[PDB]
Design a protein around this ligand. Structure first.
Ligand code: CLA
Ligand code: CLA
Ligand code: CLA
Ligand code: CLA
Ligand code: CLA
Ligand code: CLA
Ligand SMILES: CCCCCCCCCCCCCCCC(=O)OC[C@H](COP(=O)(O)OC[C@@H](O)CO)OC(=O)CCCCCCCCCCCCCCC
Ligand SMILES: CCCCCCCCCCCCCCCC(=O)OC[C@H](COP(=O)(O)OC[C@@H](O)CO)OC(=O)CCCCCCCCCCCCCCC
Ligand SMILES: CC(/C=C/C=C(C)/C=C/[C@@]12O[C@]1(C)C[C@@H](O)CC2(C)C)=C\C=C\C=C(C)\C=C\C=C(C)\C=C\[C@@]12O[C@]1(C)C[C@@H](O)CC2(C)C
Ligand SMILES: CC(/C=C/C=C(C)/C=C/[C@@]12O[C@]1(C)C[C@@H](O)CC2(C)C)=C\C=C\C=C(C)\C=C\C=C(C)\C=C\[C@@]12O[C@]1(C)C[C@@H](O)CC2(C)C
Ligand SMILES: CCCCCCCCCCCCO[C@H]1O[C@H](CO)[C@@H](O[C@H]2O[C@H](CO)[C@@H](O)[C@H](O)[C@H]2O)[C@H](O)[C@H]1O
Ligand code: SF4
Lengths: 79, 73, 41, 211, 216, 742
């Protein structure tokens, strides 16, 4: 109870917030003007994404195994 | 003692961050892809492209000396 | 009224509302469950 | 469309064209500018009105009967702290469970009209209302009134409900504020106003320079 | 025709126009807000009519008490009737704040209706009042509504007599405004009613003027 | 000529532009592409003259925004009055002013905050306040919480009125440009009404309310038994009992027998022995005389009625053989540009605030304020900081005017052009003055340090060693102390007790004021002040004069007012803009004001403030060590910072713990600013590139591209966090020390 239990609770909460933020970013990326939704938040879509974050570990492992979590062709500088 | 060794670890990893960033990005970056033509030490690349103050690797040395002094302190 | 709803969805206003709700929740929790150092469960 | 307004000589706002019952063009802050929010607010007003009518009746009639000596009910302020067959929290949880179902059906009908009109157990009941907020059928309309086909006769009854209910909301707010400000029942307040209208009023309690 | 320059916008069509405007408040060059040239004559007429009522009603009870028509319990000066309780107070059938609320209700009806007629000239005779909306349609000039109530005897049937009556109204109104200001100042300096002040100036004119009353 | 000119319904009232964040700018309205857009939006918001080019819209926006600031100030005043009416011990303090600590803030019990509710006295627990509102309310004659609550309600009503006025005058009835340019009428109306009528009204309040109530309070009458203020107006018998000259009415006023009113309109110096504050009868005669003088002054300038002076002709008349065209052309500048007016007003307001601080410690105007040491220190330091900030802003906005609104066509051979033509001589001579002052003062301090370290105290610049006496200041003190006998014979005592002549005023066993000796250390410290002030002036004046061009960059005015550099060429052109000159002037102003407040604190604690006992023996807080220990830098470091910081670092576990917490936090923030100050943008941009790669690897890169802060933004953030840290450190240190030992 000194470390491990609060650590697990924090990990759950932080994974929840991070996962829902990433999901909202991905959903906004394909829009007419993503930057406008980037400053002015689409409240209904945000609420839907936020509510779907209860089971974030399962979705995270799902996308890790499905190969839809990481990217391979990203911008880099002159090596 | 626990807290102080952890602050020391913070200082070590941060100074290493600055020095390694200076060494690896010495040959070029996205902001200035031809840094290797300007040598180790040069002031800047002008105010264009948003401003390029403290852009060379010598400046990374300069910044990391402060962190070294803080960590040893 | 649509313009008002659009203004209320801006980043500073939403951040203010969200952080106010979060701070209120934490303050009330600490009012009813104070001095919590280790997790009993 | 020249209909009476809340403010004679003024101009009715564009979003209020007089279709809804009880539409006197009253919207100084323009809260009904958005049509979807306007429908949501129509439903909210209907619900607040009906709840306030029930509350006003249940507040005022028992106090009048108690004052006349017919009944012996306590004051509506103290009825929360009375000895009932169960702990209130249990009654509150039962209340939440039942309104979960009722409010859920109402919410589903508001969001998607015409989707919860059939009894889920026996599929041959089929509430016969065509407008959101007016369920009709047998359970909520046993006597058949409000299912008539006469034009502007439904608007008449709906305006009747709208107006008695707005009065009920104002009355309930008044009862609450009066109980908080003068520590006595509403009927005693009415009898005080009737005993000496000139001096028995809101200014009677306060201490002011003039009087 | 009197007072100061002819300001080139006070031609003379207004009743009581004598081209008196040293501060140029009614210049129609920049004329927004409440300094509109169509609002100032109306406002002058309104504070004037209210001042006529106020002067008559502030001098009447004391004169009536001196003659003896009304009981001497009601012959109190105007500032000892309840306007200023710290100075003097009278007990009516209601406390003064309930009276104020009722007065504000009635005057709110009357004044908001009059305002709506000023801003919307044809209104107040269209929607259903309690049967009286027929007589409440002001004809033309907002300051002169007329009709079977506001002019129920039929004065000023022809234009010229109406002009004379308008001029008479303006002068009696301005005179009463100055009279009410005098009532206020003389009440502050002397502490007695204006009628008592008049009798004092009449009894000993040289020793009962403003120069003597510098000490209160 | 002078008349009301407005436009009906210029701007329609709607929420549409509230959903367009950057509507006011034509480039910001297109939306964001990088994170620079957010900073640009919040940075250009209230810079009206950069959006449009017509003076009418700018003037209307300025008028409405000033209405808004007035509404905010009214909300603040109402809040202070309400929080004093409901969460204070003002009545208990009224009963016993010398033992009850003022308190008007109460904290909730949540996370151990209880410890901040200290035992201030009067059966009350709360934070001790140093704003001096209790003294002001007592001087106003307030004796109940009902009056404070009424004042709070009135303040809220006034805030609503100001908000409505701002909305009205922008969105409904906007004045035209010809209305704003009536400077003669504006000066007449403001100078007569706002000043003279306001002073006359306050004099009336004092005479009719404050004099009797404070007279009864000073006599010893219990506050609950004192009659209410209107009872002195409705019943003049009481006021004649206190001041017998009221029994004559206003007859002496109109017959010019003004000497009859000499019992409540006095001219006496010094302080009230009971309360340690200025006599309120003097305050009456002086707000009355100020009212008369301002009312006479306000009838000077020409308007619609012929008589009066015309400012344009006055400016065009004063010119001579040394200055060419003289003051010609200034009227158009000052009636055309808002920035020149802002510069002049900021300079005057800052100087006035500094004068207020000096005059307020030297002649305490409120009862029981001189013996409340925390309030004195707080008020002095606060208004001194405010004045410094305003005087720096004057130079900033003057440079803005020079860059933007200057027009060489109108200014051919007037004072502005001739100042711009001999600027090298000005800057050179001022540089020499700065160097000379710095050497012959700080070198004196270093010489003293070296002599003390070498064991040769007979070779120091001290009172016992080689002396440097301030003979001019001593002569001025002696002259001002002998005024009530020769040059101001109608005065009873001198203007203040700080002059050499006079005696001691003690209230409740504490010294209120006392003659202030001046010696070698005072000579040194005023010449330090002169050094720092001339250096700050040098920086700001060099920024203003070289704002348009120099030898290095002939076309600086094309680059604008706020630009980072002009590249690494010509050897390097970093910080050549007037904005960076303001950026450095801020640091030097901080230095100067810090030295000033340290001098004030040490000198007061060492030579004025203290406790007095029977037989009239005075013991000072630090025992008169300023004369000997302030002549060395080591002396300062040991006997001021090390000695007087013992209270703030030992405040943990008491009601003063918040001061120690903020002491540490301010040291932290000041350190934090150095990372913005010492670094450059390219490093952070490349680090952000790496971090953006990291976020890209997980498909979570933002749509708005992250960017490092601009160069000017980096400088601004550094200076802001630096100033906040330093000032908060000094704030916590002063408050902890003076609350503990005061
Ligand atoms: C790394 C930083 C860090 C960490 C780990 C903590 C950790 C803690 N702080 Mg601390 N604190 C910090 C920084 C930090 N603090 C700083 C910087 C300050 C100064 C502003 C404070 C000021 C502070 C105060 C004043 C108090 C704490 C308290 C606490 C305890 C939390 C009480 C609790 O369980 O709430 C319960 C809340 C939850 C379980 C959240 C539940 C969220 C959802 C609903 C769950 C699903 C915990 C030991 C409190 C305490 O009891 O200390 C012993 C307390 O009174 N802290
Ligand atoms: C719309 C229905 C309604 C009706 C019929 C009444 C009727 C009455 N109210 Mg009431 N009231 C109402 C709404 C209503 N109120 C509302 C909405 C509020 C909240 C603002 C109040 C707040 C209120 C107060 C605070 C008081 C009354 C009082 C009274 C009584 C005397 C009238 C007076 O002084 O005012 C009278 C029986 C007064 C009373 O009964 O005192 C004897 C009194 O003190 N009312
Ligand atoms: C700095 C204070 C200030 C100043 C200089 C003005 C100046 C002005 N106001 Mg104004 N006003 C103010 C505060 C101020 N107002 C406040 C606080 C309110 C709210 C009560 C108003 C409410 C107000 C109204 C309602 C009107 C004015 C009007 C006017 C104009 C003529 C007024 C006149 O002759 O006197 C003039 C531009 C009038 C106007 O625009 O007519 C041209 C007008 O109708 N003002
Ligand atoms: C306008 C105006 C207003 C506001 C008032 C107001 C008042 N009048 Mg009044 N009065 C007016 C015009 C006005 N009068 C005129 C034009 C005349 C003629 C009178 C003749 C009059 C008499 C004779 C008396 C009042 C009295 C009163 C007071 C009580 C009224 C009442 O009981 O009903 C009240 C202060 C009475 C009073 O003061 O007691 C009273 O005796 N009035
Ligand atoms: C500059 C304006 C200003 C400031 C800084 C404050 C600050 C504060 N007020 Mg305050 N207040 C203000 C204006 C202001 N007030 C005005 C104008 C009113 C009258 C409407 C009030 C009426 C008010 C009440 C009624 C209360 C506060 C309280 C508080 C405290 C807690 C507020 C909170 O977290 O919620 C805080 C110290 C609370 C407090 O101190 O609780 C102990 C509290 O109960 N305020
Ligand atoms: C009543 C006094 C007053 C007024 C009306 C203004 C008004 C203005 N100032 Mg100024 N200023 C003042 C005092 C004042 N200042 C003082 C005392 C200082 C000394 C610190 C400054 C230092 C200063 C600087 C350095 C700059 C301004 C700028 C500006 C303009 C835009 C400010 C802005 O965008 O806000 C934005 C507000 C924030 C970002 C909040 C930060 C906290 C505006 C004309 C800017 C300008 O003129 O650009 C051309 C600018 O760069 N001001
Ligand atoms: C209390 C102090 C004052 C507070 C603010 C008061 C605002 C009053 C109205 C201002 C606008 C006046 C011009 C109207 C016209 C206008 O603004 O633009 C006009 C525009 C017209 O939209 P429509 O879709 O109706 O018409 C479009 C046309 O092309 C065809 O009809 O919008 C409106 O009419 C909405 C009006 C209200 C907009 C604000 C609604 C919400 C206000 C209150 C927010 C807070 C609520 C808190 C509740 C507790
Ligand atoms: C001392 C110098 C002195 O007598 O100044 C006063 C002197 C006065 O010159 P004028 O009499 O020509 O000035 C006429 C008008 O410009 C006065 O407003 O002006 C200058 O010499 C220019 C500034 C020199 C500043 C030197 C430092
Ligand atoms: C007043 C009120 C709402 C008022 C709203 C107003 C004026 C809004 C005005 C405007 O928005 C418009 C229209 C248009 C906008 O442009 C402008 C404004 C001006 C903003 C609701 C009351 C609503 C009142 C309600 C719902 C009352 C319910 C009562 C109940 C349920 C009572 C239950 C019990 O009393 C019993 C029966 C007996 C015991 O058991 C005890 C209990 C349990 C207490
Ligand atoms: C409305 C009014 C008085 C109303 C009085 C009322 C209702 C009294 C009511 C009561 O008393 C009773 C009956 C009985 C009492 O028991 C109770 C009360 C309630 C007390 C006075 C207006 C009074 C109005 C006055 C005095 C106006 C004066 C204006 C002047 C002098 C203007 C001058 C210029 O404007 C010009 C003409 C041209 C410009 O260019 C230059 C200048 C110089 C600015
Ligand atoms: C700009 C003005 C703002 C304030 C407006 C209200 C002013 C009120 C104060 C003015 C009255 C002055 O009051 C002063 O003279 C009054 C007589 O005139 C005296 O009044 C005295 O004589 C009166 C008869 O004349 C009696 O009715 C009083 O009982 C008696 O006290 C007061 O004892 C004295 O204090
Ligand atoms: S300010 Fe920066 S970019 Fe400009 S010259 Fe200096 S170092 Fe180079």
């Amino acid at each position: 109870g000194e470390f491990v239990y609060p650590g697990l609770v924090f990990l759950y909460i932080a994974g929840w917030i991070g996962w829902v933020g990433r999901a909202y970013l991905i959903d906004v990326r394909t829009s007419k003007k993503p930057t406008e939704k980037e400053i002015i938040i689409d409240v209904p879509l945000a609420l839907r994404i936020m509510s779907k974050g209860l089971t974030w570990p399962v979705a995270a492992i799902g996308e890790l195994r499905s190969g839809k979590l990481v990217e391979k062709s990203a911008n880099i500088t002159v090596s | 003692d626990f807290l102080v060794h952890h602050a020391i670890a913070l200082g070590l990893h941060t100074t290493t961050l600055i020095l390694v960033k200076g060494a690896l990005d010495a040959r070029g970056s996205k902001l200035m892809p031809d840094k290797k033509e300007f040598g180790y030490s040069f002031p800047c690349d002008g105010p264009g492209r948003g401003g390029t103050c403290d852009i060379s690797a010598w400046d990374a040395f300069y910044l990391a000396v402060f962190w070294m002094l803080n960590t040893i302190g | 009224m649509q313009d008002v709803k659009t203004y209320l969805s801006t980043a500073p206003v939403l951040a203010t509302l969200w952080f106010g709700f979060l701070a209120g929740l934490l303050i009330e929790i600490n009012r009813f469950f104070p001095d919590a150092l280790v997790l009993p469960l | 469309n020249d209909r009476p307004l809340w403010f004679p000589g003024s101009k009715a706002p564009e979003w209020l064209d007089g279709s809804l019952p009880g539409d006197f063009g009253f919207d100084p802050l323009g809260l009904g500018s958005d049509p979807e929010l306007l429908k949501w607010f129509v439903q909210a007003e209907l619900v607040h009105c009906r709840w306030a009518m029930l509350g006003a009746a249940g507040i005022f009639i028992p106090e009048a009967l108690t004052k006349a000596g017919i009944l012996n009910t306590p004051s509506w302020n103290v009825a929360g702290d009375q000895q009932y067959f169960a702990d209130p929290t249990t009654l509150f949880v039962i209340e939440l469970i039942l309104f979960a179902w009722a409010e859920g059906r109402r919410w589903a009908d508001i969001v998607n009209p015409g989707c919860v009109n059939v009894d889920p157990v026996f599929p041959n009941n089929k509430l016969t209302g065509t407008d959101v907020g007016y369920p009709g059928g047998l359970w909520f309309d046993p006597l058949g009134w409000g299912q008539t086909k006469d034009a502007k006769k439904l608007k008449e009854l709906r305006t009747k409900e709208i107006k008695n209910g707005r009065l009920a909301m104002l009355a309930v707010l008044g009862a609450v504020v009066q109980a908080n400000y003068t520590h006595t029942g509403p009927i005693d307040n009415l009898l005080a106003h009737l005993a000496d209208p000139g001096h028995n009023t809101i200014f009677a309690l306060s201490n002011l320079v003039g009087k | 025709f009197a007072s100061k320059q002819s300001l080139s916008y006070l031609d003379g069509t207004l009743p009581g126009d004598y081209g008196f405007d040293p501060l140029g408040l009614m210049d129609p060059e920049g004329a927004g807000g409440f300094i509109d040239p169509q609002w100032l004559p109306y406002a002058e007429i309104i504070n004037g009519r209210f001042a006529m009522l106020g002067a008559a009603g502030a001098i009447a009870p004391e004169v009536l008490g001196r003659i003896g028509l009304i009981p001497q319990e009601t012959a109190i000066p105007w500032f000892q009737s309840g306007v200023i309780p710290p100075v003097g107070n009278y007990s009516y059938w209601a406390d003064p704040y309930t009276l104020f609320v009722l007065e504000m209700a009635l005057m709110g009806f009357a004044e908001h209706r009059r305002a709506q007629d000023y801003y919307k000239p044809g209104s107040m005779g269209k929607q259903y009042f309690l049967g009286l909306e027929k007589f409440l349609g002001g004809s033309g000039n907002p300051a002169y509504p007329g009709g079977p109530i506001f002019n129920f005897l039929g004065f000023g049937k022809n234009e010229k007599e109406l002009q004379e009556l308008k001029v008479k109204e303006v002068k009696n109104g301005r005179l009463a405004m100055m009279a009410v200001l005098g009532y206020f100042t003389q009440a502050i300096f002397t502490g007695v009613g204006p009628f008592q002040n008049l009798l004092d100036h009449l009894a000993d004119p040289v020793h009962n003027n403003v120069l003597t009353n510098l000490k209160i | 000529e002078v008349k009301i000119m407005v436009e009906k319904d210029p701007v329609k009232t709607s929420f549409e532009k509230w959903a367009k964040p950057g509507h006011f700018s034509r480039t910001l309205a297109k939306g964001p592409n990088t994170t620079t857009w957010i900073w640009n939006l919040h940075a250009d918001a209230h810079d009206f003259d950069s959006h449009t080019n017509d003076l009418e819209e700018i003037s209307r926006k300025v008028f409405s925004a000033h209405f808004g600031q007035l509404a905010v100030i009214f909300i603040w005043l109402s809040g202070m009055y309400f929080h004093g009416a409901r969460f204070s011990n003002y009545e208990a303090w009224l009963s016993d002013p010398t033992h009850i600590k003022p308190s008007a803030q109460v904290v909730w019990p949540i996370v151990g905050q209880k410890i901040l509710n200290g035992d201030v006295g009067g059966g009350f627990q709360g934070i001790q306040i140093t704003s001096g509102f209790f003294q002001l309310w007592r001087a106003s004659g307030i004796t109940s919480e009902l009056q404070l609550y009424t004042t709070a309600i009135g303040g809220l009503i006034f805030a609503a009125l100001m908000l409505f006025a701002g909305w009205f005058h922008y969105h409904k009835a906007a004045p035209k440009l010809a209305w704003f340019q009536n400077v003669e009428s504006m000066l007449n109306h403001h100078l007569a009404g706002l000043l003279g009528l306001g002073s006359l009204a306050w004099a009336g309040h004092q005479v009719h309310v404050s004099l009797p109530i404070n007279r009864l309070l000073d006599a010893g009458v219990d506050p609950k038994e004192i009659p209410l203020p209107h009872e002195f107006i409705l019943n003049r018998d009481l006021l004649a009992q206190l001041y017998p000259s009221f029994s004559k009415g206003l007859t002496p006023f109109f017959t010019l027998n003004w000497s009859e009113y000499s019992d409540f309109l006095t001219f006496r110096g010094g302080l009230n022995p009971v309360t340690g504050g200025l006599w309120l009868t003097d305050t009456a005669h002086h707000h009355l005389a100020i009212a008369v003088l301002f009312l006479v002054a306000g009838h000077m300038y020409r308007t619609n009625f012929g008589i009066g002076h015309s400012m344009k002709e006055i400016l065009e008349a004063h010119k001579g053989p040394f200055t060419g065209e003289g003051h010609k052309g200034l009227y158009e500048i000052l009636t055309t540009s808002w920035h020149a007016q802002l510069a002049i007003n900021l300079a005057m307001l800052g100087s006035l605030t500094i004068i207020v601080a000096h005059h307020m410690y030297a002649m305490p105007p409120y009862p029981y304020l001189a013996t409340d040491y925390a309030t004195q220190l707080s008020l002095f330091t606060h208004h001194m900081w405010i004045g410094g900030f305003l005087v720096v802003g004057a130079a900033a906005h003057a440079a803005i005017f020079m860059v933007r609104d200057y027009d060489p066509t109108t200014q051919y051979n007037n004072l502005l052009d001739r100042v711009l033509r001999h600027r090298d001589a000005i800057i050179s001579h001022l540089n020499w003055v700065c160097i000379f002052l710095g050497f012959h003062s700080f070198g004196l301090y270093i010489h003293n340090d070296t002599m003390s370290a070498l064991g040769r105290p007979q070779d120091m610049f001290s009172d016992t060693a080689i002396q440097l006496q301030p003979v001019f200041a001593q002569w001025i003190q002696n002259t001002h102390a002998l005024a009530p006998s020769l040059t101001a014979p109608n005065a009873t005592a001198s203007t203040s007790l700080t002059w050499g002549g006079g005696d001691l005023v003690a209230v409740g066993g504490k010294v209120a004021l006392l003659p202030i000796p001046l010696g070698t250390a005072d000579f040194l410290v005023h010449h330090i002040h002169a050094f720092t002030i001339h250096v700050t002036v040098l920086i700001l004046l060099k920024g203003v004069l070289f704002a348009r061009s120099s030898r290095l960059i002939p076309d600086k005015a094309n680059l604008g007012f706020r630009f980072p550099c002009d590249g690494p060429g010509r050897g390097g052109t970093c910080q050549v803009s007037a904005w960076d000159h303001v950026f450095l002037g801020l640091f030097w102003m901080y230095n100067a004001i810090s030295v000033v407040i340290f001098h004030f604190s040490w000198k007061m604690q060492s030579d004025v403030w203290g406790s007095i006992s029977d037989q009239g023996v005075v013991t000072h807080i630090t025992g008169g060590n300023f004369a000997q220990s302030s002549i060395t830098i080591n002396g300062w470091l040991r006997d001021f910072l090390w000695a007087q910081a013992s209270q703030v670092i030992q405040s943990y576990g008491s009601s003063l713990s918040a001061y120690g917490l903020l002491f540490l936090g301010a040291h932290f923030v000041w350190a934090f600013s150095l990372m913005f100050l010492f670094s450059g943008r390219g490093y952070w941009q490349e680090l952000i590139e790496s971090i953006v790669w990291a976020h890209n690897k997980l498909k979570v890169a933002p749509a708005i591209q992250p960017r490092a802060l601009s160069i000017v933004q980096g400088r601004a953030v550094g200076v802001a966090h630096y100033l906040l840290g330093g000032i908060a450190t000094t704030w916590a240190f002063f408050l902890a020390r003076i609350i503990s030992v005061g």
